[PDB]
Design a protein around this ligand. Structure first.
Ligand SMILES: CCn1c(-c2cc(N3CCN(C)CC3)cnc2[C@H](C)OC)c2c3cc(ccc31)-c1csc(n1)C[C@H](NC(=O)[C@H]1C[C@@H]1C)C(=O)N1CCC[C@H](N1)C(=O)OCC(C)(C)C2
Ligand SMILES: Nc1nc2c(ncn2[C@@H]2O[C@H](COP(=O)(O)OP(=O)(O)NP(=O)(O)O)[C@@H](O)[C@H]2O)c(=O)[nH]1
Ligand SMILES: [Mg+2]
Lengths: 165, 168
């Protein structure tokens, strides 16, 4: 019943940057939290390890999680290719919010985004399910590799990821 | 130097704005859906014997950001109004895009081309007659396209350039 914590070890063009940890709100969105947890451990034989943050827009968010096509269009959940919006109880209140990317209603896969600002217009459209716990300065450091339309200027990867005890 | 034309591609999400632009620029067909934030491209072409530089703005169909279009509409010189022939909603959205462009540019005489895309698909829901009648009422050309087969891709962009030339 304790919310799980997971980590990303971030690399920039293969060089280490630092660790970001996340609390996953299993107490409010258990199905969505469990998807992200399992994808962070890789326990289903696939997951976030080695994937990129393909879209970084300074002032707004860092987005990643396409481990199936590695081009921003793919990803899959542990429940099938996609799964439904669990709930919209939690809001995009500020920096550090962890939320699901999607292509419209009930199309959650593995892609996610980390807010670097309040993005309230996404409330009720993207499922919020966690928050940065440690290493927000790593996410802040990732922003300078982004741009207005999100194209990145260096390859920002999840070099390693897993669940913390 | 060759004249430059600022073309803007608009229309509802998923209608094929990016697939059309990438076909024009790179001569291949993106089959995956990579929804656009905003992308810009440049290509030189020859149209009616005159070499021209196309500056193409490929815009977001993402409809929650409809309040963000005024500046690129002010800057753009001509507009491809894109719908998909198998998506009646995208055809209905066309009027809103045209009205927004005319309003933002404060003019009844803006170069535009109506583009009905995905003409390779069998699931047609918008009659060619409906599209031709609409374009006739707007006073603009109508081009049927497929980004998958390349049918009409050059014609749509080149026709828009011809519309811009007539406007100057
Ligand atoms: C108007 C220009 N624009 C803008 C925009 C908006 C503003 N303001 C709005 C709020 N007001 C109050 C202030 C001004 C200012 N500046 C810009 C940008 C910087 O101007 C260039 C956005 C945006 C998003 C999309 C398209 C165009 C867009 C888009 C296109 S697909 C999409 N969203 C949703 C996206 N699905 C996917 O990736 C699918 C493919 C995978 C599976 C998705 O799940 N996520 C996660 C959440 C964030 C979102 N991506 C994204 O990237 O948001 C970018 C952001 C900048 C936050 C919003
Ligand atoms: N069969 C077929 N599919 C097409 C055609 N044009 C685009 N598509 C497909 O439709 C989907 C969406 O196309 P895309 O060009 O990304 O559309 P968009 O208008 O740019 N979307 P957005 O506004 O989100 O950026 C993709 O899977 C693409 O391959 C076409 O002429 N024929
Ligand atoms: Mg596009």
């Amino acid at each position: 019943m304790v919310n799980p914590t997971v980590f990303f070890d971030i690399a920039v063009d293969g060089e280490p940057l630092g660790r970001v940890s996340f609390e996953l709100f299993a107490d409010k969105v258990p199905k969505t939290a469990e998807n992200f947890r399992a994808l962070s451990t890789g326990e289903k034989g696939f997951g976030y390890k080695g994937s990129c943050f393909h879209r970084i827009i300074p002032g707004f968010m860092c987005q990643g999680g396409d481990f199936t096509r590695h081009n921003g269009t793919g990803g899959k959940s542990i429940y099938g290719e996609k799964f439904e919006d669990e709930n919209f109880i939690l809001k995009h209140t500020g920096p550090g919010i962890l939320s699901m990317a999607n292509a419209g209603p009930n199309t959650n896969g593995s892609q996610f985004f980390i807010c670097t600002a309040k993005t309230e217009w996404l409330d009720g459209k993207h499922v919020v399910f966690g928050k940065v716990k440690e290493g927000m300065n790593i996410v802040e450091a990732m922003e300078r590799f982004g741009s207005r339309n999100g194209k990145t200027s260096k390859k920002i990867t999840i070099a390693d990821c897993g669940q913390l005890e | 130097s060759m004249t430059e034309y600022k073309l803007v591609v608009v229309g509802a999400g998923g209608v094929g704005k990016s697939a059309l632009t990438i076909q024009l620029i790179q001569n291949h067909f993106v089959d995956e859906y990579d929804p656009t934030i905003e992308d810009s491209y440049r290509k030189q072409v020859v149209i009616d014997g005159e070499t021209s530089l196309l500056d193409i703005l490929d815009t977001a169909g993402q409809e929650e950001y409809s309040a963000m279009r005024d500046q690129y509409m002010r800057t753009g010189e001509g507009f491809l109004l894109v719908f998909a022939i198998n998506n009646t909603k995208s055809f209905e959205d066309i009027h809103h895009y045209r009205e927004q462009i005319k309003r933002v540019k404060d003019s009844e005489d803006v170069p535009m081309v109506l583009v009905g895309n995905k003409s390779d698909l069998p699931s047609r829901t918008v009659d060619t007659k409906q599209a031709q009648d609409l374009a006739r009422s707007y006073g603009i050309p109508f081009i049927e396209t497929s980004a998958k087969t390349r049918q009409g891709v050059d014609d749509a962009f080149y026709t828009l350039v011809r519309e811009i030339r007539k406007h100057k």
